[PDB]
Motif scaffolding. Structure first.
Motif: not given
Lengths: 50, 49, 49
Positions: A32-34, A37, C36, C38-42
């Motif tokens: 769900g997240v990078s 990040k 969100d 853009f802030s939680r993904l590569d």
């Protein structure tokens, strides 16, 4: 595996660097997240299983 | 150890989260600063950038 | 008696309000908020969503 453990993590500062940069963790893949990040965002309801 | 790769015991840990729909507890190494009023600014309250 | 003009006004208001309501549709993405995503993904995953 059949009797895995569940742990509560709360009221702690998020420092994923001291885990991402550790040698033995050769697989760091998230859904769900990078992976890179994590340090940029706040969390709650944080749990871990072993 | 006599078994080949793919049969060795591997320790697996999984981390669960919810995103922004609750008051956050765990935060990153970021630093706070005083708020402002009546000025066109951008804000980062708990993650809502 | 003169609801013909009120119909025009109501049609315009409804048509222009469905657009405002439309922004809350995730449209198959994780969430309907740009920051969100853009802030939680590569970089690569973000582009797709």
């Amino acid at each position: 595996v059949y009797a895995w453990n569940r742990k509560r993590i709360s009221n702690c500062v998020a420092d994923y660097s001291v885990l991402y940069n550790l040698a033995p963790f050769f697989t760091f893949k998230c859904y769900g997240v990078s992976p890179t990040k994590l340090n940029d965002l706040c969390f709650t309801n944080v749990y871990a299983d072993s | 150890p006599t078994y080949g790769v793919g049969h060795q015991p591997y320790r697996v840990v999984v981390l669960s989260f919810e995103l922004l729909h609750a008051p956050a507890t765990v935060c990153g190494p970021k630093k706070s600063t005083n708020l402002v009023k009546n000025k066109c600014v951008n804000f980062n309250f708990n993650g809502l950038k | 008696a003169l609801g013909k003009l009120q119909d025009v006004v109501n049609h315009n208001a409804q048509a222009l309000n469905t657009l405002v309501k439309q922004l809350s549709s995730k449209f198959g993405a994780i969430s309907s908020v740009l920051n969100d995503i853009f802030s939680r993904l590569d970089p690569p995953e973000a582009e797709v969503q």
